[PDB]
């Protein structure tokens, strides 16, 4: 339960910008003595959930984040065949070794240059008949005819190791390698994946989020139109480890009905529903059958929902109120929206959320589905965009009529960090910060963070 | 500390949030104010230079101590470098400054680069330890940059025996083309320089000195490793004050470190930090600190706050911690976020006994970094943080732990084209604080904290 | 030279006015061309570095001579520095290069600055003459700039004994993370470094060497004072070639100086300049010069032309003077305005035996000036003129003569973010000139001038 400094009782509600954490007496010396695992049934080992947005939640993101202990929620209305293919891909991945970009010897240098940035490894693996035969780097593509063949620029010499080799050993094998990529082989010699020095280190820091079969975790979202029960059962059968019942205004009869319909199917999976920003909405969603309530409605005062409707709530106050209500009912809260810095993750957790959902921030990474773009200053970025009517309740004349008022798709430019270009660099950034918040507070884990935290309010100074 | 009636905000206060209400005053002159501190640091003005490699070099330590401040050498400075730095500072004259020196065989290019390590506007050419000429920036212009210093140096300059009264040196320089007097030892060797402004400052600032009359200096130590052994070595090297420094001072490892150092009975004032709470202040004092350094993420948009959400608005932090320390007979240093003389005055009004300044003083001639110039040819220097040297701590194992460590962030600190030296900043700071006391009716720093009335203002 | 029929313009020609027409060629490969010169300079490529303090330092002299050029030390360099420079250059290895070296106790800040004095991308850390590590620019990033080199140096690096076949060293570096081989003397002390590109260049460029197999170097003298005594001392210090240099070469004081030096019978090639006319070329050769340096105000907008109206378009100047020198068995150096490989090729087509290059080579790592960065953070260095060191020459009287002296003009020469080393410029120049020869059908430089057909183009 949060405590505020004496007298810090503002006549207004609080954003992540309004509050600070006061250090407390601590005997948690090292960041690594903190346990970042969550307690809400999601199965995450770090408190990061990737938002059910097409701009962010693709198969590369789902593999990469779950390996480091987060979970990705697939966007609602992804066709069920594509759900199954995505789940099968993620759940066939190695828990340590990553999936590289692969090239044919007959690919063009131009196509190789474009594909390289789909992963953060800095190299693609040339394969012939399933066997790795070389590496292609960005440097190998410079100053050559963009329609030359990959065969003519690929490097035949690279570090290789059998899949299952200790990450400690792979790390040392790469110490004096020119290219910081080890090509991992299956017993027959075919490609099993890659491991970089930083990937080797991360294996010893992050615990993979895994299902009961030991395969990487993945979640899936459903909107509240149509046959919500049938959609949810299909997602469960496709292999989702967690269902998110998602709508813009969660505190409404159609959402309550949808939760009861999914809960009555007894699918055996944690059920998230949202979004609300009130204790009353939180209670009603839990009593309908959800165990996790997703919290966040127009948290940004200048963002589209607030400027169209006036409707929203400052997110820190929303999470504090909803998490306390959920805690009294045996449930949990996900803080959804507005996260742009590790501070926001730490404050949402201090406020009592069990997990933090991140959307547009993660669009600005190699692993998000969108294409890598470059602005006027040649700086890298990717476009985030909203789910719009896929989060809303719903003749050719009649089609245009209902379509006239629906929300447009807003687009934002999310710059890639030249130093944190991969999502795993953001995860290092986020969890380094949260681990530090825990040491300042005196907390050895996330329950203790929320139990011990002291907060204050600051002015616009 | 007294606020205007009703000024009880539902939030904590930064330096930007508050103002001092003038009071009835009989303190007419700025110079009637006593700026000396009462915390055992020995400073005669309330300025301490932060233990940061970007700021706390030997030129800074000499220059600030002569004007009554003290410089804290950065933690993990190797002990031989500590001894060499202390021996340099403690061999400096109390009035006469150390100039840039040049060999006749140095190049004009090197002379030009070295001139800006001090604020004197002239380097002294020396031969066999004795002054033979002056080099100015104007002497370097329009000359082949690989010409020798001997071919641009001025052989005519004001000289006087070291020990000459600063008033008389001031007058000797009144009609000199170059505002630099070259001071000599009895054997003719260079003893230092004195400018007309340096001579005036000798009459305004009392040097901060040890019991032997030598310039004061302090040294910091982090809480990893053998803190007692490190502190004992710093004491034997001659530090006048020890600073036990860590990002999160309110933790067991810091309490243990204070007790270990205190048990060695080194005979020096012990500073420990950083905290921002009354409880943290009490705990550091009870472990053995006499002075508590206060400041944790005071800037809402700076790295610590944006990484962790952790911190506290610095005026409120200093108010609460100073009051806690004073009940126990201790003191607090206000550490962080100082950018204007107002911040120094407000820290003291809040009850701090001393104010620690870091990045602001990086933008001076005397800081250790190189003088740089931006797109508009304006001078600046980079300040950067101490990072993991303030944090608690196989090649795989090393890279594992190194992954999460705080990176070194850098900021550009512009030099004032009129306050380019740190002593100009000290003039600016102490002129302002003296005026704050005259407005409050205070004749010294205890009276400033006792008599001040403060108010809160809006974002207007 | 032959010009296309009717190409007889009513004006003189710059390097921008002319083009070379391809001829029937059986010179297939650029590597079949012999770029060695025939003027007694001993260069194996037609490049001479100008006698300018902005360019002609010891690192440049070593680096260019190893690739077959020669550097002319600036006039009025003190004879003790001449001797030190000559001794440095003539003790260099003909294949292995001199690296930047560092002490383990140097700062990261100093290491970063020194790295750019060579093009190797790495400095060698030395303790007691022995190499113990390599420092790269990447090693310096993200660490405290006052950390010690010891804490960032890489202890793993490729090493081979001096005398190892360059082709073997090239192979040894194929999978090395750092493209630098540390070459050792028999006792294991540092002898130098070799990179993969340095290994390749050893198979392309023949070092310019004296009869004892040591790298060649030249030295310049102005025409004031005791020219014969100065020339004698330069020869005694070991210069392989002397340059008698003045702004207006066609004058009595220059003729006297050439005769004075010629009469000493020093046994060295003797360059004198500068002139732009057939009459001046004949007079300098008759006075005793073997090589005439050609070039006076070749740029219509540069300082000499804008101050006096005096000069001559350089391509016409070279054509006229080279033809005149050939009638007397002499040679011509094309001095001034070279900015592209085209200019070198056109100078040689015009009949020059060698091409002297100044400010272009200031924008390299190996030039003596410091590496600078412009408003866009792009690397550059400043070239500047020798000014009154090329001119004929009470403190009142000194100021009277000084009032009219030429000021030093300064210009920014940007480094190529790739071709930052002077050897990269030599690759650019000699690749171009070799191509010119293949287009002309010439197997060597005399054939280039004998076979070339030129044309004139308009301003379009
Ligand atoms: N059939 C589909 N209908 C609608 N959206 C889809 C469909 N298939 C995939 N998507 C969406 O396209 C985006 C990219 O999905 P995914 O990463 O699975 O594609 P991919 O082509 O396999 O990826 P990659 O770019 O790595 O080749 C996601 O937003 C996903 O939800
Ligand atoms: N051996 C060392 N290891 C690490 N840091 C050092 C060492 N010696 C000095 N420093 C740091 O380098 C910076 C400059 O130190 P200092 O001014 O004493 O050096 P200096 O070279 O003698 O000075 P100057 O700038 O006048 O030439 C300071 O941050 C200091 O702490
Ligand atoms: N004593 C001197 N007087 C005048 N000019 C000099 C003197 N010594 C060197 N120079 C000039 O200084 C410049 C640099 O010379 P040189 O390269 O020999 O110096 P260095 O200090 O050994 O170089 P570096 O350390 O940068 O490699 C050249 O223009 C050279 O002519
Ligand atoms: O089109 C949209 N409009 C408004 N909110 C949206 C839209 N699409 C997604 N959202 C919400 O915004 C969250 C992501 O917020 P972000 O992390 O600040 O980008 C999602 O998890 C949804 O709750
Ligand atoms: O790397 C760092 N991160 C955060 N705080 C730092 C760092 N280095 C120094 N500090 C603190 O910042 C103070 C200086 O603050 P400044 O005067 O605002 O620059 C120091 O005295 C330390 O308390
Ligand atoms: O100060 C100067 N003014 C004019 N010409 C100069 C000066 N210094 C050197 N020079 C000449 O300019 C040549 C170099 O020309 P650059 O290669 O175009 O820079 C030298 O070799 C000299 O002939």
Question: What is the rounded CA–CA span in Å between residue C20 and residue C38?
Answer: 22
**CA–CA gap between residue A319 and residue A323 (Å, rounded):** 6
Closest CA of chain A from C157, distance in Å:
9
Distance linking the first and last C-alpha atoms of chain A: 28
In angstroms, what is the C-alpha Rg of chain C? 23
Long-range contacts of residues B263-269, Cβ cutoff 8 Å, at least 24 apart = B263/B228, B263/B288, B264/B228, B264/B231, B264/B232, B266/B231, B266/B232, B266/B235, B266/B242, B267/B235, B268/B235, B268/B239, B268/B240, B268/B241, B268/B242, B269/B39, B269/B40, B269/B41, B269/B241, B269/B242
Tokens (6 digits) for B200: 């005036």
For residue B163, how many other CB atoms are within 10 A of its CB?
12
CA C295 from chain centre, in angstroms, equals 16
CA distance B442 to C60: 67
Pocket probe for ligand 3: among C49, C51, C54, C57, the residue whose CB has the most ligand atoms within 8 Å is C57
Measured CA angle at B333 (ends B331, B334), to 5 deg: 135
Cβ–Cβ under 8 Å, residues B15 and B355: no
Please say whether the dihedral angle defined by the alpha carbons of residues C251, C252, C254 and C259, taken in this order, is positive or negative.
Answer: positive
DSSP C432-453: HHHHHHHHHT-SBHHHHHHH-E
Residue partners of C363: CB distance under 8 A and separation at least 6: C380, C381, C383, C413, C414, C415, C416
Place of tokens 């065989």: B105
Strands B190-194 vs B181-184: parallel, antiparallel or unpaired: antiparallel
Contact C67, C205 (CB under 8 A): yes
For residue B248, the distance in angstroms to the closest alpha carbon of chain C comes to: 21
| Burial class of residue A381, CB neighbours in 10 A (0-12, 13-18, 19+) | middle
The encoded tokens of residue B135 equal 């080099």
Dig out the tokens for A456 from the structure. 């204050």
Is some CB atom of chain C closer than 8 A to the CB atom of A234?
no
CB contact under 8 A, B280 and A25: yes
B19, B281, C130, C182, C202 from C173: Cα distances, Å: 66, 59, 20, 11, 16
**Backbone break loci in chain C, preceding residues, C–N > 2.5 A:** 393
List the subunits that have 3+ CB pairs under 8 angstroms with B: A, C
**Is A157 touching C (CB cutoff 8 A)?**
yes
Chains that touch A (3 or more CB pairs under 8 A): B, C
B144–C407 CB contact, under 8 Å: no
CA distance A324 to A351: 9
- Dihedral sign for Cα C317, C323, C328, C334, please: positive
Tokens 């420990």 label which residue? B272
C-alpha angle A271-A324-B317 in degrees, rounded to nearest 5 = 130
State the alpha helices, DSSP H only, in B404-444: 422-440
- Collapsing DSSP states into helix, strand and coil, what is residue B395? helix
CA distance C48 to C358: 9
Q: Atom 18, ligand 5: which residue's CA is nearest? A: B337
Measured over the CA atoms of residue A365, residue A366, residue A367 and residue A372, the dihedral's sign is: positive
Angle among Cα C172, C178, C181 to the nearest 5 degrees reads 45
Question: In B27-96, which ranges are E strands?
Answer: 47-49, 70-73
Using alpha carbons, select from B306, B357, B352, B314 the residue that is nearest to residue B331: B352
Name which of A157, A176, A178 is nearest C156 (Cβ-Cβ).
Answer: A176
Residues from chain C contacting residue A177 (CB–CB below 8 Å):
175, 177
Query: Residue C242: beta bridge partners?
Result: C219, C270
- Token pair 């009071």 is found at B23
**Other CB atoms closer than 10 Å to residue C340's CB: what's the count?**
13
Declared resolution, Å: 1.6
Q: Do C143 and B408 touch (CB under 8 A)?
A: yes
CA separation for the pair A459, A124 (Å, rounded): 50
Q: What are the start-end ranges of the H helices in C40-186? A: 58-66, 79-90, 108-115, 137-140, 166-172
Proximal ligand: closest to the CA of B360: 5
Rounded Cα distance between C78 and C90, Å, is 18
Distance A75 CA to ligand 1 centre (A): 10
Dihedral angle computed from the Cα positions of residues C343, C297, B142 and C83, in that order, rounded to the nearest 10 degrees: 60
Helix (H) or strand (E) holding B447: helix B445-451
Q: Report the alpha-carbon distance of residue A204 to residue B395 in Å, rounded.
A: 13
Q: Which residues contact C442 (CB under 8 A, 6 or more apart)?
A: C27, C33, C448, C450, C451, C452
Q: Taking CB atoms and an 8 Å limit, are C176 and A177 in contact across chains? A: no
Q: Name the maximum alpha-carbon separation found in chain C.
A: 71
List CB contacts of A107: < 8 A, sequence separation 6 or more.
Answer: A149, A150
- The pair phi, psi for residue A209, each rounded to 5°, is -80, 115
Q: Tell me phi and psi for residue C367, to 5 degrees.
A: -70, 155
C123-127/C130-135 β-pairing? antiparallel
Catalytic residue (choose from C140, C302, C321, C437): C302
Strands B47-49 and B70-73: parallel
Cross-chain residue pair A457–B250, CB shorter than 8 Å: no
Gap from CA of A46 to ligand 4 centroid (Å): 21
Strands (E), B179-328: 181-184, 190-194, 218-221, 242-245, 270-275, 291-294
How many Å apart are CA C332 and CA C291, to the nearest integer?
5
Q: Could you tell me the two tokens for C204?
A: 């392309």
Method of determination? X-ray
Return the closest-CA partner of residue B49 out of B220, B278, B279, B166. Answer: B220
Kindly report the backbone phi and psi dihedral angles of residue B304, in degrees, each rounded to the nearest multiple of 5, phi listed first: -55, -50
DSSP B416: P
Burial class of residue C343, CB neighbours in 10 A (0-12, 13-18, 19+): buried
Task: Provide the β-strand partners of residue B126.
Answer: B131
Q: Which helix (H) or strand (E) holds B282?
A: helix B278-287
DSSP state of B115: G
Distance CA A351, CA A345 (A): 10
> What is the maximum span of chain A, computed from C-alpha positions, in angstroms?
71
C441 at interface of B, judged by CB pairs closer than 8 A: no
B342 phi and psi angles, rounded to 5 deg:
-50, -40
Q: The tokens of C111 are what? A: 């290491």
Token pair for B63: 């220059």
Name the minimum distance, in Å, from the CA of A396 to any CA of chain B.
51
Which H/E stretch holds residue B359?
helix B359-362
DSSP at B175: T
Contact present, A278 and A321 (Cβ < 8 Å): yes
In the beta sheet, which residues pair with residue C290?
none
Q: How far is CA A420 from the centre of its chain?
A: 15
Q: Which chain C residues have a beta carbon less than 8 Å from that of B154?
A: none
3-state secondary structure chain A: CCEECCCCCCCCCCCCCCEEEECCCECCCCHHHCECCCCCCCCCCCCEEECCCCCCCCHHHHHHHHHCCCEEEECCCCCHHHHHHHHHHHHCCCCCCECCCEECCCCEHHHHHHHHHHCCCCCEEEEECCEEEEEECHHHHCCCCCCCEHHHCCECCCEEEECCCCHHHHHHHCCCCCCCCEEEECCCCCEEEEECHHHHHHHCCCCCCECCCCCECCEEEECCCCCHHHHHHHHHHHCCCCEEEECCCCCCHHHHHHHHHHHHCCCCCCEEEEEECCHHHHHHHHHHCCCEEEECCCCCCCCHHHHHHCCCCCHHHHHHHHHHHHHHCCCEEEEECCCCCHHHHHHHHHCCCCEEEECHHHHCCCCCCCCCEECCCCCEEEEEECCHHHHCCCCHHHHHHHHHCCCCCCEEEEECCCCCCCHHHHHHHHHHHHHHHHHHHCCCEHHHHHHHCEEEEECCC
A142 — phi, psi (to 5°)? -80, 145
User: C109: which chain B residues are within 8 Å (Cβ-Cβ)?
Assistant: 369-370
* CA-to-CA separations, A119 to A70, A125, A138, A196, B384, in angstroms, rounded: 18, 12, 12, 12, 32
**Given ligand 3 and candidates B107, B143, B145, which is best to mutate, with the most ligand atoms within 8 Å of its CB?**
B107
C-alpha to C-alpha distance for A343 and A348, rounded to whole angstroms: 9
Q: Which residues contact C157 (CB under 8 A, 6 or more apart)?
A: C131, C133, C134, C176, C178, C180, C181, C182
**Cα–ligand 3 centroid distance for C82 (angstroms):** 9
Ligand nearest to the CA of C88: 3
CB contact under 8 A, A177 and C177: yes
d(CA A28, CA C378): 47
Residue B375 and residue B63 in contact, taking contact as beta carbons nearer than 8 Å: no
Residues of A that are catalytic? 303
Task: List, edge to edge, every strand of the sheet that includes C123-127.
Answer: C101-102, C123-127, C130-135
């Amino acid at each position: 339960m949060v405590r505020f400094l004496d007298g810090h009782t503002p006549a207004y509600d609080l954003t992540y910008n309004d509050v600070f954490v006061v250090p407390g007496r601590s005997d948690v010396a090292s960041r690594f003595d903190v346990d970042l695992s969550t307690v809400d049934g999601s199965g995450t080992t770090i408190p990061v959930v990737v938002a059910n947005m097409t701009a962010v939640a693709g198969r590369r993101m789902a593999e990469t984040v779950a390996r480091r202990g987060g979970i990705v929620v697939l966007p609602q209305d992804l066709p069920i065949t594509a759900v199954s293919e995505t789940v099968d891909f993620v759940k066939s991945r190695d828990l340590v070794v990553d999936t590289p970009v692969t090239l044919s010897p007959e690919d063009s240098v131009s196509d190789a240059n474009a594909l390289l940035h789909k992963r953060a490894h800095g190299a693609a693996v040339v394969v012939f008949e399933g066997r790795p035969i070389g590496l292609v780097t960005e440097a190998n593509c410079a100053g050559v005819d963009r329609f030359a063949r990959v065969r003519d620029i690929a490097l035949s010499d690279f570090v290789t190791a059998p899949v299952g080799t200790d990450p400690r050993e792979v790390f040392d094998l790469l110490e004096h390698a020119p290219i910081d990529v080890a090509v991992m082989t299956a017993p027959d010699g075919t490609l099993a994946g890659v491991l970089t020095r930083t990937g080797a280190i991360r294996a010893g820091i992050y615990t993979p989020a895994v299902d009961a079969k030991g395969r990487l975790r993945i979640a899936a979202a459903v909107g509240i139109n149509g046959d919500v029960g049938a959609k949810a059962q299909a997602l469960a059968e496709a292999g989702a480890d967690l269902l998110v019942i998602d709508t813009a205004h969660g505190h409404q009869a159609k959402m309550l009905d949808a939760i009861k319909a999914v809960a009555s199917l007894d699918l055996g999976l944690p059920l998230v529903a949202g979004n609300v920003v009130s204790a009353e909405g939180t209670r009603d969603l839990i009593e309908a059958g959800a165990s996790i309530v997703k919290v966040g409605v127009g948290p940004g005062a200048m963002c589209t929902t607030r400027m169209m409707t006036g409707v929203g709530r400052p997110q820190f106050s929303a999470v504090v109120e909803c998490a306390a209500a959920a805690r009294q009912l045996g449930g949990h809260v996900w803080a959804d929206g507005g996260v742009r810095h590790p501070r926001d993750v730490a404050l949402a957790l201090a406020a009592g959320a069990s997990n933090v959902m991140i959307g547009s921030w993660f669009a600005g990474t190699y692993e998000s589905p969108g294409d890598l773009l470059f602005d006027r200053d040649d700086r890298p970025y990717k476009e985030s965009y909203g789910m719009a009517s896929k989060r809303a309740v719903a003749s050719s004349f009649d089609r245009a009529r209902k379509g006239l008022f629906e929300e447009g798709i807003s687009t934002s430019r999310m710059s890639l960090d030249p130093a944190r270009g991969g999502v795993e660099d953001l995860l290092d950034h986020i969890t380094s910060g949260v681990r530090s918040t825990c040491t300042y507070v005196g907390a050895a884990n996330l329950p203790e963070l929320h139990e011990k935290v002291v907060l204050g309010v600051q002015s616009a100074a």
